[PDB]
């Protein structure tokens, strides 16, 4: 006879039951993505800060290799430094330095873009859930409203007190629709900011590697005078 | 009562003005659709045919000889004239690299200028499709006010009293959507057509720059021998 | 007796046409999804394999021989041919900076063209994802407006005789959202798939420029 938040779901139509289950699954995956991504982002950011602040004292690319050598294979800055070293290693027959400077700038730019793109891996869910969960809520809502008016059309009663439970289920479908929407669109924006900040900071380390290589090449060329 | 006309002619002057204003926004969006689409098809068709002929050319001299029979307002012949003109104005130079930079910079300006020119009408389309929903919404709010003013004037709730206010709100919504939907469709169709056309024109421009650049380097080589 | 099929069978002709419009939009969005899903799966699978083959190469002549047995629709073979063709057309010249620039410009044009040519269907998906709620809304607004002018005349004070008209109207916006939701999902999936694919193809093009750039400088050095 009576109802509650749960009892209203227990009496609901199978179409809107399925919608409500869809939003609760969208809720638990958007939070599971948030905690997984956040713990990675914090550790990647904290590592890169320590690696940059430690590399900031290097005066030649040879010294930067000796600084970076014990960072570990997961290090972004050791990866970038190797990329730069490998372009010299493959270019060993060249007298032209401007080509080496250009090729290294090109490689490191693609690596910085690749790491930025790789951190975005889960974001398709956050963006999609934030976009569709309002609509998917409304659908449940509209279906509940239809079932209430179908209830009148199939029973010939005119008392709005029989409509009230049916539209309560409908408004609940919108409510759970926003509970899935809001975290997802907030968290998508938050990470889009954290990706841009991390990608720019990694670009600052990439610029230091390019500057060290470019400067030490120009000194090596000067020594022939 | 009558299905639309009787309902419209009974509406408040503010809603009549919104209805007429949105019908004018509808006829201008269909007018600029037909008016520009027949131009756009002809510019796409001609540019495709000119590209299909120029695709075989192996020197800029040959590219002039094949293109010279194109129409007086041909886009491709305009770019070939532009590159030939940058060369004829530079004939005292020994540095060919300055001819290459100036030609590249001048063709990039002319491709962008035709890109702006081809977009001429899109301000209407993008504006009407963005704001006609809210103009419809304002009309609904006025219908809603007129329903409550009706209730306040008769001090009763009988359906006859709200009828004119909800009639106004329905019409203002309906015409609000009829203005919006075509404008959003037509704007996306032209955004796609502009992207395709402006890319084709950029491909012809790149072919002219390639062909000029290769010829200048072969002429320099043939002198140096 | 007013079940979904009965409501469609007992609706106004204008709102019937709205139901058919959204149902045909639902058909075309699923047709685009199945059509492009196999294309992305096949093109991305092939390009990943071609990248892992070419990543071992150390000169442009070696890359041309490694790719020599790739199928005629191979995008990496197409880019290697595009680079090789700028060498053979330049054969009578020694402006190596010129050859490097002209090649770079050709490959970036071709990668942009493949990306543009591979986002073919998205104009439907984005349009249907934007407008399908609104054409569904126009259907229900029209259905309500018919039912109202229906009570304007033949005045019937009973709520029970308009309730079918209310449900028949609401069904048009329900069918609208059932068309809209797949369109927004499929559009985001293909936006992200194209983004990954376009970047993978860009890395193949970058390897071709890097191989050529080293090879020309090494040849010019060995000629000293």
């Amino acid at each position: 006879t009576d109802l509650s938040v749960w009892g209203m779901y227990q009496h609901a139509d199978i179409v809107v039951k399925c919608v409500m289950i869809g939003l609760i699954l969208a809720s638990v995956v958007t939070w599971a993505i948030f905690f997984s991504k956040s713990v990675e982002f914090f550790n990647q950011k904290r590592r890169l800060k320590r690696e940059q602040q430690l590399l900031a004292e290097a005066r030649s690319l040879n010294q930067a290799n000796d600084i970076a050598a014990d960072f570990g294979s997961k290090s972004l800055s050791l990866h970038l430094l190797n990329e730069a070293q490998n372009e010299l290693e493959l270019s060993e027959g060249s007298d032209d330095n401007e080509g080496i400077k250009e090729r290294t700038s090109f490689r490191l730019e693609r690596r910085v873009a690749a790491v930025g793109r790789q951190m975005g891996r889960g974001n398709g869910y956050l963006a999609t859930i934030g976009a569709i969960s309002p609509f998917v809520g409304l659908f449940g809502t509209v279906w509940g409203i239809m079932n209430s008016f179908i209830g009148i059309a199939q029973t010939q009663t005119t008392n709005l007190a029989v409509v009230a439970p049916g539209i309560a289920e409908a408004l609940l479908a919108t409510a759970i629709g926003l509970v899935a929407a809001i975290p997802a669109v907030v968290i998508y924006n938050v990470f889009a900011r954290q990706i841009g900040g991390f990608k720019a900071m990694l670009g600052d380390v990439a610029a230091q590697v390019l500057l060290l290589q470019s400067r030490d090449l120009d000194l090596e060329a000067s020594a022939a005078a | 009562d009558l299905s639309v006309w009787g309902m419209y002619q009974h509406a408040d002057i503010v809603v009549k003005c919104v209805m007429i204003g949105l019908i004018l926004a509808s006829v201008v969006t269909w007018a600029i659709f037909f008016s520009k689409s027949v131009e756009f098809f002809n510019q796409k068709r001609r540019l495709k045919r000119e590209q299909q002929l120029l695709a075989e050319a192996r020197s800029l001299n040959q590219a002039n000889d094949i293109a010279a029979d194109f129409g007086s307002k041909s886009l491709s012949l305009h770019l070939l004239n532009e590159a030939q003109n940058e060369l004829e104005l530079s004939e005292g130079s020994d540095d060919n690299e300055g001819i290459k930079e100036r030609t590249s910079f001048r063709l990039e300006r002319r491709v962008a200028a035709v890109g702006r020119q081809m977009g001429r009408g899109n301000g209407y389309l993008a504006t009407i499709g963005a704001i006609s929903p809210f103009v419809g919404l304002f009309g609904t709010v006025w219908g809603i006010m007129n329903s409550f003013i009706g209730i306040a004037q008769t001090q009763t709730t009988n359906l006859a009293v709200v009828a004119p206010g909800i009639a106004e709100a329905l019409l203002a919504t309906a015409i609000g959507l009829v203005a919006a939907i075509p404008a959003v469709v037509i704007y996306n169709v032209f955004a796609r057509q502009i992207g395709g056309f402006k890319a084709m024109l950029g491909d012809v421009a790149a072919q002219v720059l390639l062909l000029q650049s290769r010829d200048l380097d072969l002429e320099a080589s043939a002198a140096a021998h | 007796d007013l079940s979904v099929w009965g409501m469609y069978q007992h609706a106004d002709i204008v709102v019937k046409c709205v139901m058919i419009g959204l149902i045909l939009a639902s058909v075309v969005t699923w047709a685009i999804f199945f059509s492009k899903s196999v294309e992305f799966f096949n093109q991305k699978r092939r390009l990943k394999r071609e990248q892992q083959l070419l990543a071992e190469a150390r000169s442009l002549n070696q890359a041309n021989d490694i790719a020599a047995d790739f199928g005629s629709k191979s995008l990496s073979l197409h880019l290697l041919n595009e680079a090789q063709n700028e060498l053979e057309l330049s054969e009578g010249s020694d402006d190596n900076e010129g050859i490097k620039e002209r090649t770079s410009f050709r490959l970036e044009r071709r990668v942009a063209a493949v990306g543009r040519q591979m986002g073919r269907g998205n104009g439907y998906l984005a349009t249907i994802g934007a407008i399908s709620p609104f054409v569904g809304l126009f259907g229900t607004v029209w259905g309500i407006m018919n039912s109202f002018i229906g009570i304007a005349q033949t005045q019937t004070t009973n709520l029970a005789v308009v309730a079918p008209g209310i449900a028949e109207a609401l069904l048009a916006t329900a069918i609208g959202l059932v068309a809209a939701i797949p369109a927004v999902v499929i559009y985001n999936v293909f936006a992200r798939q194209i983004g990954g694919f376009k970047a993978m193809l860009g890395d193949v093009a970058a390897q071709v420029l890097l191989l050529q750039s080293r090879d020309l400088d090494l040849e010019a050095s060995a000629a000293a």
């Binding site: 398709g124 956050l126 963006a127 999609t128 934030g130 976009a131 309002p134 609509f135 409304l138 509209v142 409203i145 005119t158 008392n159 709005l160 929407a181 669109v185 998508y188 | 929903p133 809210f134 919404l137 609904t140 809603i144 329903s147 709730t157 009988n158 359906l159 709200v162 909800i166 709100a169 329905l170 919504t173 959507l177 | 994802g129 709620p133 609104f134 809304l137 229900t140 607004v141 309500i144 039912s147 109202f148 009570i151 004070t157 009973n158 709520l159 308009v162 309730a163 209310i166 109207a169 609401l170 916006t173 809209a180 927004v184 559009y187 985001n188 936006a191 992200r192 983004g195």
Partner: peptide, 30 residues
């Protein structure tokens, strides 16, 4: 990307306006 990643407002407003109009016919009719 250009991936839809935002809550668009106007479908929500228009369907809620449709629901308001539905209760403005039904409720005074009863």
């Amino acid at each position: 990307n250009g991936e839809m990643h935002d809550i668009n407002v106007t479908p929500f407003i228009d369907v809620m306006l449709v629901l308001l109009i539905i209760f403005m016919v039904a409720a005074p009719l009863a």
